[PDB]
Ligand binder design. Structure first.
Ligand SMILES: CC(C)[C@H](C(=O)O)[C@@H](O)C(=O)O
Ligand SMILES: CC(C)[C@H](C(=O)O)[C@@H](O)C(=O)O
Ligand SMILES: [Ca+2]
Ligand SMILES: [Ca+2]
Ligand SMILES: [Cl-]
Ligand SMILES: [Cl-]
Lengths: 364, 364
């Protein structure tokens, strides 16, 4: 019957861009005959304000009742004095990932044609282009490893976190990266610190075990400090980057920033049953919230990931992706995608949503 | 009496650039009346070839007998099939740091005037320039934390590393970063992942404790994934970056690469008694080794750090730094610092050393 989506728009620009994601989703529901019901739940800063914590029980319950979470962005100044550890971002995202076993984070980042000038890369490097998919392991490693805590007092007070990975955890994320490379340019670069970390020694070992099932995919390994340098220099040489939790956190963000267009980038965090949480790569931009300035493309393309990965609605997902493409090549750019002197052509959040939804309707 | 230096040139370009470091050191020894004796010991790949391990006992003993280690670079293809964990780089550097308690790594990276085109930053960002000093904690955190290892077999085989920090470890590195900021632009950005890690929660806490002694230095905190993005975008806004072991590894390398000129960058790793190990930021470049191509400036400026920090010879250290400056502004550039069409003006490793040593002699 009807798919059920828990909508967790969160803070800042989350609600206004989500409104555009929902608009485009309505055009897709009509075009493809999907029956999707949505329920909205507070999360993040709005949840602390409304319910006293960033992830209320009723929100958590609504995500359990759903086929996917369509997630906005969480965080901002108002809760920044809370300890970084009662704070809304980690307090929303980490238990959602842990609870639903969302072990796989997919962050596709590409330099779009015509938007190279916006990348912070030197012009000859951005002109080459890139398209890197970061596959990051999201539920193990040092984020969730135990023991974590502190003991002692005074100078000798000590804090500890444990990075742990099992062969099973590593091989499930590696297979995702290999399967994804098969569909792309047939290369996985696995990113670790095997010269220092026991977890990375096992990581590199297990990814090489997984590789035997993918004779058509090239595998290379690289150290995280070297990967961060090489992305600056030659990001066009990477296809799929495969990382543990902490390394993928850093590298996916680095690659996103190298596009210079984070308002175009979306993220899927999924479990093995196909449930996921789909969100823009960027933050809640509380400075521009409520102004019709924010670029809703990242949230619209998060809707498209949700349709593909959780709802198994490939044609609907790709129709949204084509409508975004059409916007970007038909002069429908928001302010942050425009060179400072073309800024007077900017479209508002609503104009972008209207255009992209209308494109879907026109059969793009 | 005489200072004693253990010279560990290592592999690849290490010996040929070290030869230039020693040449420039001779000019400084004559100019300032320093009596410095040097003994050379195998380390890294040459040590595995000559002695069966990357850090022979006799090499370790020679560093104990010395006032500092002048270190080249270690590693390359020939030992790359060894497990990344019997490998020469980690096998030289990690026990040297552990043994001598070299808790403080100083990596100054700046965009030199006239070399902005080489930075992989977009031209308007590199034109702004930057000068970022990375202060990285080198002997704790996850590199040396216990337990480290693996247990189990098959799917459930698991590996673990423990990130640990005590208040004492954090406050000693933080004071270095604050003292260094006082001398520079009076800002420390401490880099952690306090939204996830118990170690980073204590890190951020303790750095804020240390800050009370530095009312003139501004402190800001930033998450490592956000620091990696922001360095790409606005590296001119950072002065001193203060990081734990694993975060400083990644960020110092990222900043080095953003200069586009790694052959200019040097590194000091020091203990609280002033003993240190001084090395170029870049690797052993085995592809260009033995050709008089390699830029010896990084190794010469490592000699200058050694004179300042271990030998308390400030005037000699700054005379070398001025001689490098003179080379860079008097057309003495090696090949990798020249745009592809100016490449015919390149100087060889020896011409650079001769020039820089002669400048010191001329009283630069
Ligand atoms: C909020 C934080 C815990 C989170 C992470 O580290 O995973 C965020 O940085 C992200 O990338 O989603
Ligand atoms: C060789 C490796 C262990 C080392 C590190 O991680 O510290 C290197 O990357 C460095 O920066 O010196
Ligand atoms: Ca992140
Ligand atoms: Ca490094
Ligand atoms: Cl991890
Ligand atoms: Cl660490």
């Amino acid at each position: 019957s009807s798919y059920q989506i828990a909508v967790l728009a969160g803070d800042g620009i989350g609600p206004e861009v989500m409104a555009e994601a929902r608009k485009v989703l309505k055009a897709v529901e009509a075009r493809f005959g999907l029956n999707i019901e949505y329920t909205e739940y507070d999360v993040g800063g709005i949840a602390i304000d409304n319910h006293g914590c960033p992830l209320p029980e009723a929100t958590l319950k609504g995500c359990e009742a759903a086929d996917a979470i369509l997630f906005g962005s969480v965080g901002g100044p108002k809760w920044e004095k809370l300890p970084p550890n009662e704070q809304p971002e980690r307090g929303a995202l980490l238990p959602l990932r842990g609870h639903f076993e969302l072990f796989c984070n997919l962050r596709p980042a590409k330099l779009h044609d015509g938007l190279e000038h916006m990348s912070p890369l030197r012009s000859d490097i951005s002109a080459r282009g890139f398209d890197v998919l970061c596959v990051r392991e999201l539920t193990g490693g040092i984020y969730f490893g135990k023991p974590k805590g502190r003991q002692g007092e005074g100078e000798s007070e000590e804090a500890f976190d444990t990075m742990r990975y099992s062969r099973r955890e590593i091989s499930r994320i590696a297979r995702i990266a290999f399967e994804a490379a098969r569909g792309r340019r047939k290369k996985v670069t696995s990113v670790d610190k095997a010269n220092v970390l026991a977890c990375s020694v096992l990581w590199r070992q297990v990814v090489e075990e997984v590789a035997v099932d993918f004779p058509d995919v090239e595998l290379e390994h690289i150290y995280i400090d070297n990967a961060t340098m090489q992305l600056l220099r030659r990001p066009d040489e990477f296809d799929v980057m495969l990382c543990s939790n902490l390394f993928g956190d850093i590298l996916s963000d680095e690659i996103a920033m190298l596009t210079g267009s984070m308002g175009l980038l979306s993220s899927a965090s999924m479990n093995s049953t196909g449930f996921g949480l789909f969100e823009p790569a960027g933050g809640s931009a509380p400075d521009i919230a409520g102004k019709g300035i924010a670029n809703p493309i990242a949230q619209i393309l998060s809707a498209a990931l949700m349709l593909r990965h959780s709802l198994k609605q490939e044609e609907a997902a790709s129709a949204i992706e084509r409508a975004v493409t059409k916007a970007l090549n038909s002069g429908y750019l928001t302010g942050e995608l425009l060179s400072s002197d073309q800024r007077h052509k900017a479209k508002t959040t609503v104009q972008m949503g209207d255009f992209i939804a209308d494109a879907v309707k026109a059969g793009v």
